[PDB]
Design a protein around this ligand. Sequence first.
Ligand code: NAG
Lengths: 115, 81, 74
Amino acid sequence: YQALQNSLGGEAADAGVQAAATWYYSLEHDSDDXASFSRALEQATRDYFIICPVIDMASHWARTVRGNVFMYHAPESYSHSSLELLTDVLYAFGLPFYPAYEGQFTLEEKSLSLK
Amino acid sequence: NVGQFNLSGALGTRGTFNFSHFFQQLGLPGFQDKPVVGSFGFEVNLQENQNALQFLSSFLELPEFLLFLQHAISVPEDIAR
Amino acid sequence: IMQYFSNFIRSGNPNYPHEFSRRAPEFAAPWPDFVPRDGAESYKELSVLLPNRQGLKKADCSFWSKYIQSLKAS
Ligand SMILES: *[C@@H]1O[C@H](CO)[C@@H](O)[C@H](O)[C@H]1NC(C)=O
């Protein structure tokens, strides 16, 4: 209950926003499958808190001529969950080339990181 | 009731299958209300057998099962005896 | 399509012209039953190949039947 209300609420929702998001993302408040419920909630909160605010800021920055705007998106990965860095930081800072991670990255990940 | 061994009013103990030996291997009192060997030297996992009994009980409640039965009755005996 | 509709009128099943015969239809592909569960909900598409498809307008009809019918229920 608290996970669903706190996520999309706390000045982020009235009783109507919660219901609309529940419909849109198929969020089941009274389930016991923490796995499925967490997956649906994580999809709901990633868009609300992370992805859509990024797109809104890029749109505002381009629409009002505040500077040059360039957007990327790093698609889903399954490979390096032991590292707390996400895919965009791991490639942008060149972790496939770190001596501490020798033997853990393919030559394709090294080549992608270098680009 | 088969899954929960609530069988005192449905099963007697006169039959030739040895229920006392079966329950002794399982560490169970009997009818309520190591490799374990059951009938004919089959190795028995009680939790798998109880899951299988639960599966059939819900399998018999599916409205899809009646439709399956209706369609399966019509399959020719030439291809399915 | 006239054979589908004639079969339903005669026997209550678009696949069979007779109530007491269950020989498979040969004029076209069989028409599945409508099973009201997610993943099922099959229909016959009335196009040239007469294919069987699943979940007509699933997103749009969820909007009207779940979200909108709950807005009108409050
Ligand atoms: C069941 O098995 C036990 C041990 O194998 C044996 O002592 C008992 O007599 C058996 N019950 C019968 C034969 O009715």
